[PDB]
Design a protein around this ligand. Structure first.
Ligand code: HEM
Ligand code: HEM
Ligand code: HEM
Ligand code: HEM
Lengths: 146, 141, 146, 141
């Protein structure tokens, strides 16, 4: 479903306040601490044997910045989410072999990271607009698993 | 299932919920209803307005049940049997909805206690809510 | 995703051979025998205490014909599934209070009923086109739960 | 979990699969790969052509494992431990994929044995496959 003008104002106005470098590093560290098995997809980043290693691993920190920077391009393409992420869907399927069920779990972690960093902006209605965005980005990333 | 570190992590974050079971419980139901509006099919009798007396009263009940589960974290199947039969047989609430609420509960803690809900505590609290959700689901099939 | 011409030919050519009255009654009876709790939504149809009752209940038989007749209108609107089922989504939400996760389970039963009735048409590739149709009809029926 | 009627229903439908474990197993994997192509991420090494030698060999293995589970239907947790650790730890296969395969297994029986897979037998076989899926998932979390 397309974003109404109310949804569009919540998303666009909060994303202007987000520190994308910090929140992305936070979300990827949380994904690898809350789901420790998924480290399998990132073993080439080196030391990740426990939460302290993960939080000080710089390859994890930089990967998190790029992932959330990529998610943040959805805010400029709210009417074309499926079409914007088609190349990146195909790479997660054919190259990284990542189960498309995992896109929802990272999306749910991003919502928690945003809630913690912006407690007064993340109202019930702001949260609902962001959950709709994470649902659509997850679906778009799952869409070229042919 | 839960480690001794998970159990102490869960008892620590939950002590911050003490004194705010109605307030935190009410906000987590308001978040579930707005972000996952399909969940309103189970509450056709409720006023769905903000800080509705019925939402306050149900929020207190859910968080009180979670408070008792933290106290009896060693035997969740025995602490939650009465609720397990209510959810899984009388209301027949589908398992995916429990995931939606556990996520709204994690957002409420993150909003009110950002620093307390560290990545390690987040990991433990997610694990505890999944376990609580599985006892309320164990006879739904 | 839109149906390609190959998908469209599988769906359109098999649906011309379907006995909609028989297959619908079969699918609703199977839904109430495989998931006995869902009888809660149909108690006004009367006797359903066991599988023999369900298979001889005429209100179940007729309801099954109408449900599969409704699903069969998707075959005429393959480019507009979401828009065709919007009124029927809103009725399942506001009137029948049915959890939208259940639309996938009936869709999976319809695939089994079709496989059993048309064993030589229901090829690996025909099955894949039908699973894509049941996925889209389920999503369209879940879409007006506001 | 499974009733004595479910167990005898399951042993009856499965006797029709006898002599066709490679054929039925191969068709159920071909159906999963085509109807749920996301499942191909787990099999990057396989030739995915029809009646590929690798698909035939894996189809025989999955159906042989299900044959042993029907024989040990009274204690599925003990019959499937070796596979449980392989799936839930070494391959870390997500729980939703098990549902996709159990559905492709029900379609293969429906195609080859339409009359045998009556609504009551369908109900029992779905229940057995969910139980098998849960033993292969029990340590994934
Ligand atoms: C919000 C959801 C996601 C977005 C927007 C996202 C975005 C990205 C981006 C932009 C890249 C870099 C592509 C390149 O420049 O080559 C990437 C790589 C990767 N992603 Fe994701 N991703 C997401 C979710 C996930 C999830 C859930 C997993 C696994 C659990 C995952 C695993 C990977 C892996 C393994 C790589 C390759 C890393 C490397 O070798 O450098 N992604 N993703
Ligand atoms: C952490 C998970 C949950 C806990 C601890 C929980 C706890 C409770 C409790 C304590 C009650 C009241 C029981 C009583 O009054 O005797 C209850 C009732 C109810 N719960 Fe839940 N619940 C949970 C999840 C859910 C979810 C996910 C749904 C639906 C989306 C749900 C729907 C209901 C409904 C419909 C009632 C009856 C409401 C009424 O009319 O008062 N519950 N639950
Ligand atoms: C393929 C998916 C589905 C389709 C196309 C479908 C279609 C229909 C149609 C056409 C009606 C009649 C509407 C009217 O004329 O008033 C209806 C009613 C109903 N449906 Fe569905 N339906 C589907 C799935 C389900 C599921 C999964 C459930 C519950 C498990 C369900 C429960 C109901 C109920 C309770 C009614 C009202 C019955 C009555 O009082 O006569 N539906 N549906
Ligand atoms: C009824 C459910 C299932 C059963 C009984 C089953 C059984 C088996 C068996 C017997 C093996 C071979 C173990 C061995 O060779 O020692 C195996 C391997 C495997 N299974 Fe499954 N399996 C099931 C479901 C699934 C699903 C849903 C997936 C993925 C979508 C999956 C992916 C795999 C993979 C990737 C392997 C390793 C494949 C290889 O390279 O040979 N399995 N499973």
């Amino acid at each position: 479903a397309s974003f109404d003008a109310h949804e569009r104002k919540f998303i666009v106005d909060l994303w202007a306040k987000v520190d994308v470098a910090q929140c992305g590093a936070d979300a990827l560290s949380r994904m690898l601490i809350v789901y420790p098995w998924k480290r399998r997809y990132f073993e080439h980043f080196g030391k990740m044997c426990n939460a302290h290693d993960i939080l000080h691993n710089s390859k994890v920190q930089e990967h998190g910045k790029k992932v959330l920077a990529s998610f943040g391009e959805a805010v400029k393409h709210l009417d074309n989410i499926k079409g914007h992420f088609a190349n990146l869907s195909k790479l997660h399927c054919e190259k990284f072999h990542v189960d498309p069920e995992n896109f929802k779990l990272l999306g749910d972690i991003i919502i928690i990271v945003l809630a913690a960093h912006h407690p007064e902006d993340f109202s019930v209605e702001c949260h609902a607009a962001f959950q709709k965005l994470v649902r659509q980005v997850a679906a778009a990333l799952a869409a070229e698993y042919h | 299932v839960l480690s001794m570190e998970d159990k102490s992590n869960v008892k620590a974050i939950w002590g911050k919920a003490s004194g705010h079971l109605e307030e935190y419980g009410a906000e987590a139901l308001e978040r579930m209803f707005c972000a996952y509006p399909q969940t309103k099919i189970y509450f056709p009798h409720f006023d769905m307005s903000h800080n509705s007396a019925q939402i306050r009263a149900h929020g207190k009940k859910v968080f009180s049940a979670l408070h008792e589960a933290v106290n009896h974290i060693d035997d969740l199947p025995g602490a939650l049997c009465r609720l397990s039969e209510l959810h899984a047989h009388s209301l027949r609430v589908d398992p995916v909805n429990f995931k939606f609420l556990a996520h709204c509960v994690l957002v409420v803690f993150a909003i009110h206690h950002p620093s307390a809900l560290s990545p390690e505590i987040h990991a433990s609290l997610d694990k505890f809510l999944c376990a609580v959700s599985a006892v309320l689901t164990s006879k739904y099939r």
